Amino acid sequence: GTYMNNTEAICDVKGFAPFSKDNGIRIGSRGHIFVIREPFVSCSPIECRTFFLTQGSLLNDKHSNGTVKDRSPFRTLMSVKVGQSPNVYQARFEAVAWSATACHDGKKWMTVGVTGPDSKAVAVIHYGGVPTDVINSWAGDILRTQESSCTCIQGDCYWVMTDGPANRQAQYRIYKANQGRIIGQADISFNGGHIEECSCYPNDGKVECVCRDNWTGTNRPVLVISPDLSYRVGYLCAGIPSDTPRGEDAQFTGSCTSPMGNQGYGVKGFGFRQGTDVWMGRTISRTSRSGFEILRIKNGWTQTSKEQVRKQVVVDNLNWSGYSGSFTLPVELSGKDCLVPCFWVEMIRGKPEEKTIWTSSSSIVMCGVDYEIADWSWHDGAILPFDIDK
Amino acid sequence: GTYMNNTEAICDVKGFAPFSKDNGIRIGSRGHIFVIREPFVSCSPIECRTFFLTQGSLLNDKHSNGTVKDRSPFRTLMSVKVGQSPNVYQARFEAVAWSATACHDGKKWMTVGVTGPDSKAVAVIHYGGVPTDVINSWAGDILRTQESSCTCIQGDCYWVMTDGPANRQAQYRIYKANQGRIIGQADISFNGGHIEECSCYPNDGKVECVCRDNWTGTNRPVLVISPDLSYRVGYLCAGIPSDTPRGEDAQFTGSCTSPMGNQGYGVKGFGFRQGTDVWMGRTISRTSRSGFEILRIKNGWTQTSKEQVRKQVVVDNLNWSGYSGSFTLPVELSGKDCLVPCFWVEMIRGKPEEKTIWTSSSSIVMCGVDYEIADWSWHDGAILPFDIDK
Amino acid sequence: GTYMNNTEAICDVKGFAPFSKDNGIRIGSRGHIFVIREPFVSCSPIECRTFFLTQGSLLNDKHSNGTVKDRSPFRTLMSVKVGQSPNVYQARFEAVAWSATACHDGKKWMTVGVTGPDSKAVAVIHYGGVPTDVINSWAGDILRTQESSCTCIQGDCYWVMTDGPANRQAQYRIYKANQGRIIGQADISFNGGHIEECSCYPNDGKVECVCRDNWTGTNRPVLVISPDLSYRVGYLCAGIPSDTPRGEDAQFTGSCTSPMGNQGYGVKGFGFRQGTDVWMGRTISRTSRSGFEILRIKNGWTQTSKEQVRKQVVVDNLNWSGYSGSFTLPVELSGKDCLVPCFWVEMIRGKPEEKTIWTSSSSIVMCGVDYEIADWSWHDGAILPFDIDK
């Protein structure tokens, strides 16, 4: 019955402690577990949940054949409580979706699920368990969205969407809803820039997003959104690249405005502003989706700094990672007067890196704390290949 | 503690967006999923649920042998939340039933389940999880009902029942209950007409139903029911047939009063009044239960019109469909001042079309929206035959 | 927060309509379902539940080997909602038990589970999910209880227990509890009589029980209990036997006071008083646990009557039955001003009648209605033997 404010500042944190780990793929060796992608977390005032995409198929079953396309007619968004595996019998249905975002305004859950044909996809907004509004593709080229938590401030929820080429100039938009109804939108002017799969969080009454340039950028785009949908758009200032693939730190020069690095492709990732500093997540490998570390760059939010002051390893470089994204703990759960910054790391198993017929992932979730946390590796741990691969 | 009014008008909609898809049969390749028929949807003020019939058997098990008769002593009505698969461990028991209808009056769930012998079946009304009243066969020939959501207006719930031949003159009745107790009934006078498996919804304080003629009609009967159980009965005026099998549109002349088409058999289907227009669902094939499209015929509710102004494809003609039925979103969930029109499409897999020992189905659920939605096909997607078929 | 009165009269009913059927054994062919006995029903103001005994073993698993003794250290009482199968993932734990009874006082659930050695068993009373009190064997010979719903009137709950020989004079006691604490007990004086496995229900502010004589009686003992624990004890007056095994009706003379029939063994069963009439359940076969019918004998509660005025078949004589027991619907669920009489019928599959290594059962539940209901057979339906038997 009450909207979450989410107007607070992000907590200044010295490190990240383990929240949860689902072990979904290990369990899936025998249990009944969805083949998934993007196990992103979002929290209501009472609990955090892991959302994920399914193909309607289970681990160790013929339907887990990974030849089916990502944007299939079978693709749905579902969810479970954080730390639970994406198993069938604990799962809540959310939306038909091959692209998704989701957030809670303090009263109910809002989800957006994109489905339909690439040429004219439909984004169906769900609020409180029923469809409430719709967004059709405005540019006829794979309407898509964050694949992480959206952001609700004082009852209104915001998210970023892209429509157009995945490797050249696309079009980018900010949408705003209240109670599952669209109340505003704004086109993001970003000539020469590329925005994909934004990882957002609230901070000081604004929505801050760290996204993925899939065009020429090895640094991450940053978009700061005000409630009237005026915005600031650019790149993460830091003189260290955090996309994948990327070049070496020493061969990089940062920019607050422009993409640097001259490389294609990318991986969904996140970053958290800490005053003027930044925490930036990245895969350990410069070239592959293996390992995951997080770095604190002093003045990295505002300057082309290379002054690294913290580093914490969460998945070693001997293990596969994947997508990563941001969310915050509601003050109603943390009991703090700031917004605890949190992230999930997806850990991809199977194709193409390993010899299976399938690909899935599991997650480790970490939350920002007031203390330095030691390095370690909470990797997926499943033993490949599986019975079905034989 | 409060009855749903459901006195509003049906929303005028330009198209239908995907609500949910369960992927039950794909999941059933490995998971523990009921073999089902008729995954019909009905909503309470807090959630929508998929109801379905079971035989007590699971996909990929010997008991899924489809030699067992529909009207078996094992047949039960169960339910899950919309988008969930009809799996064992999320299922709620409802009623012993080989024919069913179900609706929520705003306080509790009412279900009617028909079981017993063809010569003298018993319809047991359940309210709030216990049997409350009973209807015995009045004509000794397979007492049966809607296989879709019933309809509650201001606390009283209504439904249509048939008793008699499935291919000649039968008898048709309207029943009315409050709190699971029969409070009224009326015989439907329809000489030369045939009523089966009505798909109803509320509109303007009346219950409107689009049914199935299984006698000689390729157009659908329409029954409009007032709370005092006076009624209007006839056929969907539109000069386009929507039953299956049917002839071609060009070879058809509509009628508001009489069955046209001169063909036997049929398939459960639905239609929504839009002022004087209609949305009519139908299989794409004229002869088989494959594909599903919905058409808007201008003035089709009141005139023998052939003026098609909209068409949306939801399951292509390369894929199996089946039953379809109507329900509405409560205003308490939609947040609208009208009754959002919604439908589910059952997608039948296995016998007789495919070489398996079993038959089941899955669903796609769609809800009316204020925008045109692109064609696509959210088909079942299961890969037949299964392990058990070998 | 409110005690159920349960002071009303039992509804006069003309027949019994199907409430629920779990299909547990059919589902267990593939699903994860407890091997059970005694699927007895009891209702709280919000729902009815099926309770049952487990051995910690699942259908189609080696542990379902039926060589394990009934009174094992593994035996537990668990429960699910009525109509659900006794599956692992929907089950609620209740008590360690190889004999049980259970009832809800309107605020919480009370269960009594008997376990321990035959020479000195312990009956642990559970209230609201924790042990609250205890009853040790008073006669050192298999302390045991109803295996059906106990009975709560105005907050105090009553049940019948036996301790001693199963084929000669035993000792019988009535216990009374409030909030899981023993507040009273009474020895039942019944020289020459035998009381086992009572099926009780409330009626007119008293607890009426129809039990099993396992000594020499083919008619059923009847015990009527007042809240001060004064009681009346005897036999069901009717001149028709309802135990199994029994002789033929024509060879029987009834008695209100004494056992007739001169045969050993028995089967748990039930009966409902209707003014002075009775509804009596019994297996169809005189010698085996097959079939189930219910008969109304005019004046059968008070006279040695043979005047049968109703008969309804619920499981034909081609199918296995088993235990049966009584319970009532709370007025808070039925919405009636009387106590709707209800019964469950257990349907035993496997050993000794069939060639399997295991034995389990499933249930059909029926509730009294104001109308005559047609005969039919809602039998178990599982296809024996199973994979494990091969």
Next chain:
Amino acid sequence: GTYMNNTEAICDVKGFAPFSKDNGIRIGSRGHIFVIREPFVSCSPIECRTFFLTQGSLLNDKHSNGTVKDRSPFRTLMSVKVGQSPNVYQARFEAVAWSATACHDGKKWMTVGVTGPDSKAVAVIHYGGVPTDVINSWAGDILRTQESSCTCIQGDCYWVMTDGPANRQAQYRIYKANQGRIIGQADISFNGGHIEECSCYPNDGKVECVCRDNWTGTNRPVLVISPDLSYRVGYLCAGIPSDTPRGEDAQFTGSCTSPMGNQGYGVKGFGFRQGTDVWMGRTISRTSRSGFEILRIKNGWTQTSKEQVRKQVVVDNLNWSGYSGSFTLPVELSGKDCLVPCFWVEMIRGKPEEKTIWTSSSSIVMCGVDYEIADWSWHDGAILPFDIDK
């Protein structure tokens, strides 16, 4: 919305009645059940739950290979209701953990899960389903905690932690939290003493703990903690040893202050103060983790007594036992004016005692009652080896 006082005295009990038994390993033969350790119980005002450690693996699956180390990156704390098996589809995620404790303050659940590298582990405190605070290793040698219920008194919760050698002098600390935030801590001075895996309970407004000396003691350390974190520390006075391994009773002399017995190793166990008497749990074997009995030693809490006045066997010496720990029933559930003393007994199956590739355990839970309870054995009961072992 209300804190539990837990200031009462422990109930004086004459024996222990069975609360629950999960049969997890028997069920796991076919069902989907976590491979676990330490099924410890803790209660909120509404229910008791079994907590347990998992490796992300299921019984009868290759991942159950017991070669994985206890302190793995996969190890998580999860929980179910008491008596339920640690199955996947009923499980609630709690914390990433290879060591754990958990308790409810009356408003919410607090859990502490230790994970990370031995050299610098991190203990993450969870309150109400999110991380709230952190404790890093203060001595760089396997930070660890109780593996049983912690203890909440008047809203503040306390627990004991160890950091250092498992076979020589370590360091021991008491921590105190409110609402998941550390509010106090104290170093335990215990030169020559060893504290591991404390089993605590509240009594008279203090926290009493009976722990495990893994250094030279066959008697158990006792630590009594006051809310200001002043404490009393020593050994269980009784002239009978209760650790495992241990020597014979006749060869033992007790001490209130010092470890006796001169043997290494140990097993988690418990004890309950009864005025000046004690109930002490122990394995029946002096050398192995088989059997479980509980003894009442008159004046054993305060004197080097050998006066055994009660003994109750719960698992015979023909069956495997394992860890044991203490918890109490809230007065809000028991309805008593004292704190009912309760314990769980873990029953370990598989390696090293039996020829399997895996090790798991199941539990029997017992609660103190006002009556003598007969000996019996509620052992695990699973039939080894399993399919996977072949």
